[PDB]
Amino acid sequence: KDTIAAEHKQEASVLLNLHRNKINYLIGETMARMTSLSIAIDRPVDIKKMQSILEKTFDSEPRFSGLYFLNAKGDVTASTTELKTKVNLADRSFFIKAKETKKTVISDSYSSRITGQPIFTICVPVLDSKRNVTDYLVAAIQIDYLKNLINLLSPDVYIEVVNQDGKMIFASGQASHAEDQKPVSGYLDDISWNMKVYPNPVTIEE
Amino acid sequence: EKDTIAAEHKQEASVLLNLHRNKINYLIGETMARMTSLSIAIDRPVDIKKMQSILEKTFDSEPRFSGLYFLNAKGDVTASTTELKTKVNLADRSFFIKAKETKKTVISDSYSSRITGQPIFTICVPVLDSKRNVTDYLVAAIQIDYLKNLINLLSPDVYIEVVNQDGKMIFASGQASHAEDQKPVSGYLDDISWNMKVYPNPVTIE
């Protein structure tokens, strides 16, 4: 029984690596796209050009809740989501941190002010020649997209992702599959979310 | 007995194979993403002075690149992170030929850089006008050494080999003597036809 259990633990550890890599790739690639956009856009930014870019970047990319451009004040000035009212994001932690650090920020999860759904965001400050922040690129990723990705590959195993405060980010599978099991866990690269993959129990065969 | 520890050594070679393939696949995917976002963000028609600055900013602090270049439709290098001594034309390169014909991103096999003289592989992204004619090319050359050092840094003590589809050695990490009497766990990368072979460690006295 110890031998099958050990196979099951190794399998869980394989899934842990597989699924974290998928998420790390999505996050990393998005950081790289937003960074390249911030570098290549011609100053001063033409807002209709930026709107076109965001739409083209968004197109056929289910990972995104939306892509947005903000002015120095945090007003959303371009948006893949058709906005019904003016939106300002200056109060968001990621915005406060991006402004302060003048570096890319990857936020914890929260409920989108624009769509009402759970997202997390990658924010890249756009700088002028004097290193002053003039604008912000914001890529909002849909948490549910990540969850569904994992669940489709691994429907029969219980996987949890939680943040440092212990907030559930998402959970995939039936928690019952986890009974009497200790999980195999590990953090993501760009955000301190911890993924826990529970090994499946040893069945009657044996 | 032995067979049980050998099975563990094999599983860890498999873990390493996936770790390292994931790393290189990410590097290639991220670089493609950076180049495609660049072509989308920049004003058209492309201004060569602005492209030159963008390439320098992209290249700066990126050990991965041998160099970044922009080619005109004839294959002349028109922007370059590498100081050029004479005119350079890459129209004879296989990747250029395939990029021109397919009008899609191409990833090349390894070769010796005409510009730096070092072993590299390149990622080439054609730039198209409104009517889908190819007018220019973005070229990102990555140093093989960078990949080799990347693998070595993670796994000094195990023998790993990367060979292309024809059996040409791309690079090896570690001492070949560690592979003696072992069968490798192997797999191809995603976007380039290189096969990575990770040899498990021998069973020790313990």
Question: How would you explain this protein's 3D organization?
Answer:
- Two copies of one chain form a homodimer.
- Chain A is an alpha+beta fold and 206 residues long.
- Chain A folds into two domains: 8-43 and 143-198, PAS domain (Beta-Lactamase, 2-Layer Sandwich), CATH 3.30.450; 44-142, PAS domain (Beta-Lactamase, 2-Layer Sandwich).
- In chain A, 34% of the residues lie in helices and 26% in strands.
- Chain A contains four helices and ten strands.
- In chain A, strands 1, 2, 3, 4, 5 and 6 form a six-stranded antiparallel beta sheet that branches. Chain A has a four-stranded antiparallel beta sheet with strand order 8-7-10-9.
- In chain A, strand 5 and strand 6 form a beta hairpin.
- The longest helix of chain A is centred in the first third of the chain and has 39 residues, at 2-40.
- The radius of gyration of chain A is 20 Å and the shape is elongated.
- In chain A, 34% of the residues are buried.
- At the A-B interface, helix 1 and helix 2 of A face helix 1 and helix 2 of B.
- Chain A: Oligomerizes, probably forms homodimers; oligomerization is assisted by FloT. Interacts with FloT.
- Chain A: This is Sporulation kinase D.
